Amino acid sequence: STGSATTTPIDSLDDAYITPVQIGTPAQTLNLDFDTGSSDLWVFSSETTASEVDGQTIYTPSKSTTAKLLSGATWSISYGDGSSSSGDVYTDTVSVGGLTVTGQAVESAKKVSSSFTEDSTIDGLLGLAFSTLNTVSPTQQKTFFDNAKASLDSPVFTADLGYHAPGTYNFGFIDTTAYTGSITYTAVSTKQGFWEWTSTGYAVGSGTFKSTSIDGIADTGTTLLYLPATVVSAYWAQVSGAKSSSSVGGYVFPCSATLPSFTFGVGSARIVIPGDYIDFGPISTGSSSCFGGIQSSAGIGINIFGDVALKAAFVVFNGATTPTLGFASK
Ligand SMILES: NCc1ccc(C(F)(F)F)cc1
Ligand SMILES: NCc1ccc(C(F)(F)F)cc1
């Protein structure tokens, strides 16, 4: 079987993407953030503290004839940006774009951090990293992808994120009309639970390509591109007036500047990120300083190929027994 769902940016900056997901019987439709950097499916629910809910659609297990409380199970998660949430665990039927999994662990948030409360358009997260990162205790739970793997025509899903436009998550098949040229596959390390791979280098604008290994993770749940300080400094040096601001927490640049493109290597192939993708707009309403989409990973400890990079490509997450990542131009 297969599944296919449209994913839509939540705002005009492509800060995140939401995808409708059907949970329960009868279906309750929630808009979830598909996150290949985490492995928990958690939702705002009727059990969430009422003051921590501001416009979200909530999952109500008591109205689902297929929901079962997973006795004694709890979950607690903290994301790399400081966000967190926690609660209890149900099992229920979950469907994405026609692809149905029964007995999926649905983690019901009793408490959420402020950053989720303020994001009225995101009803929860759907983790798509490896199940070793799932936070359910005492019994670890499998991701939606892991549960679906057996019935999928092919153990893959693909991410086709749009620039200021809707995109597609496909499960179980590779749409050969969605990209140009060939798909270049590269090896994945699962030792930390992430879709971790090694990029073969980079180029700034029309400059020479610098062959150098950059280890990082493919993370649809992170907005920006986080790279080593040496790379990020070489990019922003080509933007007149750009500077790293400690008060802002990263590189900013004059909104009137034109940004050079950024190329990253996948094996022998090259993925070009247009300079317009790196502009994340004024740091405050009316400001003439704009926030950059390429930032240093030094404070983070891991390099992150977030949405800025991934939306420049058609990306195959190959969940075969030896997993690989595929990249194609589009
Ligand atoms: N998108 C989920 C996520 C969030 C943070 C991290 C970090 F910061 F730990 F690398 C990885 C993955
Ligand atoms: N990387 C996971 C993640 C995704 C979204 C959010 C936000 F924006 F909703 F706070 C935080 C953390």
Q: Read off the tokens for 161.
A: 């994120």
Bridge partners (DSSP) of residue 215 are 198
Distance in Å from the first CA to the final CA of the chain: 25
Type of residue found at 252: V
Q: Are 251 and 257 in contact (CB under 8 A)?
A: no
Distance CA 265, CA 61 (A): 46
Q: Read off the tokens for 216.
A: 């990082």
Distances (CA, A) of 23 to 8, 10, 80, 144, 244: 19, 21, 27, 12, 44
239 alpha carbon – ligand 1 mean position (Å): 28
Q: Read off the tokens for 104.
A: 């999926």
Instruction: Return the residue matching tokens 């027994």.
Output: 321
104 alpha carbon – ligand 2 mean position (Å): 22
Where is 147: in which H helix or E strand? helix 144-148
Type of residue found at 59: Y
Mark 192-203 as b/e (b = at least 16 C-beta within 10 Å). ebbbbbbbbbbb
Distances (CA, A) of 100 to 103, 104, 325: 10, 10, 24
Instruction: Return the residue matching tokens 């899903």.
Output: 157
CB of 69 sitting under 6 A from ligand 1: no
Sheet hosting strand 303-305, strand order edge to edge: 269-273, 262-266, 196-204, 210-218, 303-305, 225-227, 294-296
- Active centre residues (catalytic): 35, 199
CB of 79 sitting under 6 A from ligand 1: yes
272 alpha carbon – ligand 2 mean position (Å): 25
Distance CA 28, CA 6 (A): 17
Q: Give the up-direction half-sphere exposure of residue 94: CA atoms within 13 A in the CB hemisphere.
A: 26
Instruction: Return the residue matching tokens 């967190």.
Output: 84
Distance CA 277, CA 330 (A): 14
Pairing label, strands 250-254, 289-292: antiparallel
Resolution in A: 1.8
Distance CA 170, CA 99 (A): 10
Q: Are 310 and 293 in contact (CB under 8 A)?
A: no
* Residue ranges with strand state E in 10-150: 17-23, 28-35, 41-44, 68-78, 84-96, 99-112, 124-127
Distance CA 89, CA 136 (A): 8
- Residue 47 burial (CB < 10 Å; 0-12/13-18/19+)? middle
Domain ranges of the chain: 5-174, 175-330
> Mapping DSSP to helix (H, G, I), strand (E, B) and coil, where does residue 171 land?
strand
Distances (CA, A) of 231 to 112, 204, 264, 294, 298: 35, 9, 11, 10, 11
Instruction: Return the residue matching tokens 């769902």.
Output: 5
CB of 163 sitting under 6 A from ligand 1: no
37 alpha carbon – ligand 1 mean position (Å): 6
DSSP structural state of residue 118: T
Distance CA 172, CA 205 (A): 36
Q: Read off the tokens for 231.
A: 């790379």
Distance CA 92, CA 71 (A): 14
Ligand 1 atom closest to residue 304's alpha carbon, by position in its atom list: 10
Q: Are 291 and 283 in contact (CB under 8 A)?
A: yes
CB atoms near residue 1 (< 10 Å) = 13
Q: How many helices (H) and strands (E) does the chain have?
A: 4, 24
Q: Which residues have any ligand 2 atom within 6 Å of their CB?
A: 16, 33, 35, 37-38, 79, 81, 83, 115-116, 119, 122, 221-222
Residue to mutate (ligand 2; options 79, 114, 117, 194; most atoms within 8 A of CB): 79
Experimental method: X-ray
How many residues are listed for the chain in this entry?
Answer: 330
Residue 274's nearest CA partner among 284, 261, 283 is 261
Distance CA 14, CA 69 (A): 35
Q: Are 271 and 327 in contact (CB under 8 A)?
A: yes
Pairing label, strands 99-112, 41-44: parallel
Bridge partners (DSSP) of residue 198 are 215
Residue 307's nearest CA partner among 267, 283, 273, 275 is 273
- Residue 288 burial (CB < 10 Å; 0-12/13-18/19+)? exposed
Q: Read off the tokens for 77.
A: 């998660």
Classify the phi-psi angles of 72: left when phi > 0, otherwise alpha if psi is within -120 to 50, otherwise beta. left
* Residue ranges with strand state E in 97-248: 99-112, 124-127, 156-160, 167-171, 180-187, 196-204, 210-218, 225-227, 243-245
